[PDB]
From Swiss-Prot:
The keyword Phosphoprotein applies. GO terms for molecular function: ATP binding; long-chain fatty acid-CoA ligase activity; NADP binding; oxidoreductase activity, acting on the aldehyde or oxo group of donors, NAD or NADP as acceptor; phosphopantetheine binding. This is Carboxylic acid reductase. AMP binds at H295, S388, D409, G410, T414, D487, Y499, V500, D501, R502, K508, K609. One of its GO terms (biological process) is biosynthetic process. The N-terminal domain likely catalyzes substrate activation by formation of an initial acyl-AMP intermediate, the central region contains the phosphopantetheine attachment site, and the C-terminal domain catalyzes the reduction by NADPH of the intermediate thioester formed from the attack of the phosphopantetheine thiol at the carbonyl carbon of acyl-AMP. Large-scale domain motions occur between the adenylation and thiolation states. Phosphopantetheine binding alters the orientation of a key Asp, resulting in a productive orientation of the bound nicotinamide. Its cofactor is pantetheine 4'-phosphate. Keywords: ATP-binding, NADP, Nucleotide-binding, Oxidoreductase, Phosphopantetheine, Phosphoprotein. It is an enzyme of class 1 (oxidoreductase). Catalyzes the ATP- and NADPH-dependent reduction of carboxylic acids to the corresponding aldehydes. Catalyzes the reduction of a very wide range of carboxylic acids, including benzoic acids, heterocyclic, phenylacetic, phenylpropanoic and fatty acid substrates. GO terms for cellular component: membrane. It comes from the Bacteria.
Length: 631
């Protein structure tokens, strides 16, 4: 039935969901026009009192019976941190940083951080706002070349890193003279691998003659608890226009986020990106977050639950190896997926089908969908949203058949904020739009059946610029002040839009046909044999190739050579037949990769998107050699 009825039924039978309903009085107080961002956050966190705010998987420390090594092992439960405790921890960090005897920090300085998403990272983010720092969250998969370049541009006074990334942090700090302090977070007292990582970091710094101080965030909080709270708001140079955050995207360019635009994450217009946050019903917001804080989508969900009195459960591991465990324990009411997560779930379903030898829409097949919905994903899902990348209709249909709720598609960017939701512009923040012909790619407003062109918009959430890069900023605005999305869209009904592709992903083959490479990647990603695919073309050639990571099942059946190429070929031609793709849209030959694209190896971005230039760097020589061999 309707969302209103399903919400009412859930809160009538589920005490945890009932208690997570927003309190309108808290939001009204926190969002008043007179309050600065730091005061807004404080009003939300203090307003929700002792409610659970954040949850992380519990762990135990065991001694290995052979070596005596003290090892952490996850336990089958989450432990929560209340709104009160989160605010107290963030104030403790702010107090310690501001009053440090040798390397205090002051408003307007920069802090750069490398981590995933966690209670500690959230506390450090908030503390940065309380102090008036500018935060620079760095990609965990970036090379040290990239880290050093961003650190040179931003000259941070403080560097923060999770234990996992501490070696890269040390390398960056050593080459960045502005760094005075290195804070280590997600540090687990008593765990040998964490203690050894911090000792090694201290030793490397000492060997280099560095004056950088190393402290765990555990220690920073313990010292800060006994210190007076810093006064809010911080004494920055520009009020609501002070620089609060830089979101590096793409040297990568840093999108500037003033306080007023960070405030939109905290009960502002971002609650309309993937849902109807404006009008009833008010859905209790219990959510699992698997997105790094370095990506805007990580911020949307996390600050969304914090600003609505709900709860964010953090996935236990960045590589997603605990995904189903965590969703089954957390049992969220609201889902946010991106396509690579939807593909993973589809692959899980296909992998069950094959293990038990059941077919398409059999009773057994439907029982796997039911178990996914009710057990693995928790059975409490009321709403679901997706975004950050295109998804094929077939994958959308699968996900909706599993969840038995509509999957909202939200389109937006770091630069513009949320732009549309289920084809319709999000207004506010969007105030004006137009389509721009792209003749060199064959996209015109006179196209049939639908006008097509690059989307340009005026919007309240537009970035003021890229940090220290006014020439790059000028390139993304036209002469009338519209922001150029770089994205080709079709207007399929009045003020309703569908994504075609990024301009950068559109390729003109040698016989003059145009291909939207990410549309093809989304289509072929649904092959039961494909784990990942990157479609590759050349202006000098008349046909496409692809890098394909087969599923473990495909590799076990066909190997990694000619046999699996032939099976993949059949599967892709099948998809081309069903979805009406042209013959020139079908990859003719393949580079087979048994090593998945990952965030760790840098081929996926923090958001899980396949980075075309990283694929090109790793496989481009082999792809071009295959073109030459075949010619
Ligand atoms: N719902 C969506 N459908 C298709 N592509 C999307 C969607 N949302 C975001 N994108 C893509 O992601 C880009 C923004 O990425 P980011 O700046 O990481 O949010 C856009 O310019 C599009 O290429
Ligand atoms: O869905 C949004 O509004 C943002 C998307 C992105 O930057 O990927
Ligand atoms: Ca700790
Ligand atoms: Ca311009």
């Amino acid at each position: 039935q309707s969302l209103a009825e399903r919400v009412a039924r859930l809160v009538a039978i589920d005490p945890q969901a009932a208690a997570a309903v927003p309190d309108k009085a808290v939001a009204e107080r926190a969002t008043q026009q007179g309050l600065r961002l730091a005061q807004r956050i404080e009003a939300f966190l203090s307003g929700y009192g002792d409610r659970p705010a954040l949850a992380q998987r519990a762990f135990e420390i065991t001694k290995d019976p052979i070596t005596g090594r003290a090892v952490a092992t996850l336990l089958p439960k989450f432990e929560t941190v209340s709104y009160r405790e989160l605010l107290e921890r963030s104030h403790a960090i702010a107090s310690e940083l501001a009053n440090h005897a040798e390397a205090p920090v002051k408003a307007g300085e920069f802090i750069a951080t490398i981590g995933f998403t966690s209670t500690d990272y959230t506390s450090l983010d908030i503390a940065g706002v309380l102090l008036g720092l500018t935060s620079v969250p760095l990609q965990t998969g970036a090379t040290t070349d990239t880290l050093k370049a961003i650190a040179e541009e931003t000259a941070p006074a403080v560097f923060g890193a999770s234990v996992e990334h501490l070696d890269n942090a040390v390398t960056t700090a050593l080459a960045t003279p502005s760094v005075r302090r290195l804070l280590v977070f997600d540090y687990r007292q008593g765990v040998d691998e964490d203690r050894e990582a911090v000792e090694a970091a201290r030793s490397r710094l000492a060997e280099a003659g560095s004056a950088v101080l190393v402290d765990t965030l555990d220690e920073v909080i313990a010292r800060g608890r006994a210190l007076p709270r810093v006064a809010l708001p911080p004494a920055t140079d520009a009020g609501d226009d002070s620089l609060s955050l830089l979101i590096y995207t793409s040297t990568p360019k840093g999108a500037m986020y003033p306080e007023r635009n960070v405030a939109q994450f905290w009960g502002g217009i971002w609650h309309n990106a993937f849902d109807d946050g404006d009008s009833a019903p008010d859905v209790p917001d219990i959510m699992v977050n698997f997105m790094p804080l370095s990506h805007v989508a990580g911020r949307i969900g996390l600050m969304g639950t914090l600003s609505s009195g709900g709860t964010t459960y953090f996935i236990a591991k960045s590589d997603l190896s605990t995904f189903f465990e965590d969703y089954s324990l957390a049992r969220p009411t609201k889902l946010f997926f991106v396509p690579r997560i939807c593909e993973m779930i589809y692959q899980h379903y296909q992998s069950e089908l094959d293990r038990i030898g059941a077919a398409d829409g059999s009773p057994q097949a439907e029982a796997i969908k039911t178990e996914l919905r009710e057990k693995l994903l928790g059975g409490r899902v009321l709403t679901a949203g997706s975004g950050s990348a295109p998804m094929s209709p077939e994958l959308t249909a699968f996900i909706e058949s599993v969840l038995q709720v509509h999957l909202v598609d939200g389109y937006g960017s770091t630069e513009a904020g949320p732009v549309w939701r289920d084809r319709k512009l999000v207004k506010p923040p969007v105030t004006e739009h137009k389509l721009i012909d792209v003749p060199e790619l064959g996209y015109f407003s006179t196209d049939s059946p639908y006008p097509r062109g690059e989307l340009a918009i005026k919007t309240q959430t537009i970035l003021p610029g890229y940090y220290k890069r006014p020439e790059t900023t000028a390139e993304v605005f036209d002469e009338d002040g519209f922001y150029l999305t770089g994205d080709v869209v079709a207007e399929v009904a009045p003020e309703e839009f569908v994504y075609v592709d990024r301009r950068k992903n559109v390729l003109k083959l040698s016989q003059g046909e145009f291909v939207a490479l990410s549309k093809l990647e989304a289509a072929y990603g649904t092959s039961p044999l494909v784990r990942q695919i990157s479609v590759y073309g050349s202006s000098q050639r008349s046909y496409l190739l692809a890098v394909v990571v087969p599923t473990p099942e495909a590799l076990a059946k066909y190997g990694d050579g000619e046999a699996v190429k032939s099976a993949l070929g059949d599967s892709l031609q099948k998809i081309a037949r069903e979805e009406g793709l042209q013959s020139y849209e079908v990859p003719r030959d393949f580079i087979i990769e048994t090593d998945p694209f990952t965030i760790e190896n840098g081929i996926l971005s923090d958001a899980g998107k396949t980075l075309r230039p990283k694929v090109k760097a790793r496989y481009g020589e082999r792809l071009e050699a295959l073109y030459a061999q075949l010619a």
